[PDB]
Design a protein around this ligand. Structure first.
Ligand SMILES: *[C@@H]1O[C@H](CO)[C@@H](O)[C@H](O)[C@H]1NC(C)=O
Ligand SMILES: [Ca+2]
Ligand SMILES: [Ca+2]
Ligand SMILES: [Ca+2]
Ligand SMILES: [Cl-]
Ligand code: NA
Ligand code: NA
Ligand code: NA
Length: 472
């Protein structure tokens, strides 16, 4: 294998590195996987389809302009170069290789498109028509956007967009399911908590956080239990950033944030899908859980779950490992059909006060077709009132002892509107047996005399009843 000769490839430290602080992409390339035959679409502010490092891979069938209702996603050019983001993201996935221009995409032989959908009024219908674009042609969708990262918002997909997620994973890609890759958020400065973002908190999105070059939690990071894994992105000014295609046929070395991490993940997922085109949307999440690497990512909350895997709320299961992903994909056995076990926990409303603990021992639908012995995602769907929402911290403990933070204190969230059947999601108990005692903790983290009531707690378990590995 001959590595790319592109002029900025040496600057793509998160690929070209030789000091083990990288995404192990060369190993996949050397196995013969560069993205041939895979189609990825960037859902953002447009794509410069004539960019010298994108044109060779550009796919009009992966593209649309939902803002102006036409097929051509070319960005709107302005003095401030506002609409540059989709072009930056596209090059991370699929910039052309060995052409003397800028660097390379992770999947530099994949086909790449863009949906111009952020440059206008972004309605539920706009989101739904973007997520649902050409779903039997596009394999993988990448979205580096979501609800305002102000640390006070709780919001997620409305009805059309949620319907688009369920149609995508159910009937998309020939019934194997659209793969929706999501950036977990850029609200770290505001102490945002990313389970309050219903796009990344969805089970249907493969949510990705960031690590800095030196292996630390970047300033912009949001911790939450819904995140699955991590890719490198930007950090402090001594740390390098992401190198990619830029608006006006240029090359940038300064792409940043979790917005840059999701496209890198989408590229790795494209290499993985080339290695096994029959992988389902759930198969792909299993591969990420099994192969991602904690090593040398620094966080104070690394914990070993019930099947021996290390998990962090900043990083999920750790750094994506492209070589390991493509290797495991090749002989992967399709997982069994997804089961869903619904457990209504409360028999009466519960005053929260300073602190509330709810314990329930469950059988996880024993004796039923939805019996689960091998968890995937779990949700605590909570309905509660509280006078100051951001003073709450919420934890969920699995029978195996895995403590998932469902919500951390958000100092800027003054809302009195509580949570209305909000489906807080955790990936941290993946592959555990969910039978036994679950514990919900709700705590007032302030000294104020706050008050409210928990009126509904639905524990929703997803998973199967077959095929477990020996614990790590
Ligand atoms: C894909 O997986 C399904 C489920 O295991 C199987 O029935 C089908 O034969 C597979 N198709 C290919 C092309 O491997
Ligand atoms: Ca257009
Ligand atoms: Ca190039
Ligand atoms: Ca956020
Ligand atoms: Cl469901
Ligand atoms: Na919404
Ligand atoms: Na998600
Ligand atoms: Na148990």
């Amino acid at each position: 294998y001959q590595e790319p000769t592109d002029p900025k490839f040496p600057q793509q430290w998160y690929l070209s590195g030789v000091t083990q602080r990288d995404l192990n992409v060369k190993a996949a390339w050397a196995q013969g996987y560069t993205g041939h035959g895979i189609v990825v679409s960037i859902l953002d502010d447009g794509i410069e389809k004539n960019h010298p490092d994108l044109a060779g891979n550009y796919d009009p069938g992966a593209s649309f302009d939902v803002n102006d209702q036409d097929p051509d996603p070319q960005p709107r050019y302005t003095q401030m170069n506002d609409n540059r983001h989709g072009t930056r993201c596209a090059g991370e996935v699929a910039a052309v290789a060995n052409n003397g221009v800028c660097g390379v995409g992770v999947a530099y032989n994949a086909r790449i498109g863009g949906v111009r959908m952020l440059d206008g009024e972004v309605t539920d219908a706009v989101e739904a028509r973007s997520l649902g674009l050409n779903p039997n042609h596009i394999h993988i969708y990448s979205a580096s956007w979501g609800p305002e990262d102000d640390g006070k918002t709780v919001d997620g997909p409305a009805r059309l967009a949620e319907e688009a997620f369920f149609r995508g994973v159910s009937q998309g890609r020939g019934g194997l399911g659209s793969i929706f890759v999501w950036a977990s958020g850029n609200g770290g400065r505001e102490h945002d908590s990313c389970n309050c973002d219903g796009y990344t908190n969805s089970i249907y999105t493969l949510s990705i956080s960031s690590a800095t070059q030196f292996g630390n939690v970047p300033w912009y990071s949001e911790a939450c239990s819904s995140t699955l894994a991590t890719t490198y992105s930007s950090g402090n000014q001594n740390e390098k950033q992401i190198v990619t295609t830029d608006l006006r046929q240029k090359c940038t070395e300064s792409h940043t944030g979790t917005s840059a991490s999701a496209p890198l993940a989408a590229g790795i997922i494209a290499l993985t899908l080339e290695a096994n085109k029959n992988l389902t949307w759930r198969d792909m999440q299993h591969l990420v859980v099994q192969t991602s690497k904690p090593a040398h990512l620094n966080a104070n909350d690394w914990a070993t779950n019930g099947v021996g895997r290390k998990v962090s709320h900043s990083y999920g299961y750790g750094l994506l490992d492209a070589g390991a992903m493509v290797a495991l994909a090749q002989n992967w056995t399709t997982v069994a059909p997804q089961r869903k076990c619904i457990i209504d926990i409360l028999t009466e409303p519960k005053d929260i006060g300073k602190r509330l603990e709810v314990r329930k021992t469950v059988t996880a639908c024993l004796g039923e077709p939805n019996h689960i012995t091998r968890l995937e995602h779990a949700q605590a769907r909570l309905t509660l009132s509280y006078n100051r929402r951001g003073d709450l911290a919420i934890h969920l403990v699995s029978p195996m002892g895995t403590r998932s933070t469902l919500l951390a204190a958000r100092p800027h969230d003054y809302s009195a509107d509580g949570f209305n059947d909000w489906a807080f999601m955790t990936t941290h108990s993946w592959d555990e047996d969910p039978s036994g005692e679950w514990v919900l903790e709700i705590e007032n983290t302030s000294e104020a005399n706050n008050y409210g009531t928990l009126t509904k707690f639905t524990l929703v378990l997803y998973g199967t009843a077959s095929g477990s590995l020996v614990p790590r």
